[PDB]
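User: Predict structure, ligand heme C.
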Amino acid sequence: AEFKAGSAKKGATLFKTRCLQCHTVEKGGPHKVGPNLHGIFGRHSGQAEGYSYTDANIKKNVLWDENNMSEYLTNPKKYIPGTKMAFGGLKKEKDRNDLITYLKKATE
Ligand code: HEC
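Assistant: Predicted complex:
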């Protein structure tokens, strides 16, 4: 994909309604169905401490950045075949840009 910085204020609303059910962003934050996302950018996949991932998410070994995250969030199951989740993706590019703008700051 091709990320363009958007609205982190809209990104925070999108995280609450589309991600927060399964994830947290705070340092030391708890894992829910999905892993806590603190430090996700600039780190390889399957490395949230204390979270047990599928072989698919571990074997992907993607170094998370703004662009591959955008591609991933479009359809996680297409990007990482074998990943297990009741999530189909964030289809609108504007949403992905807004979400990632917020996420880059929230997980820092
Ligand atoms: C529950 C229905 C979920 C929603 C909604 C979202 N995600 Fe998720 N995510 C979930 C699980 C169970 C997992 C782990 C899957 C596995 O194969 O083990 C994940 C994983 C991620 C990751 C990868 C983390 C890593 O360390 O590699 C990211 C980056 C991620 N999820 C982000 C994310 C965002 C931003 C969401 C809202 C757009 C979101 N997920 C929705 C479960 C669920």
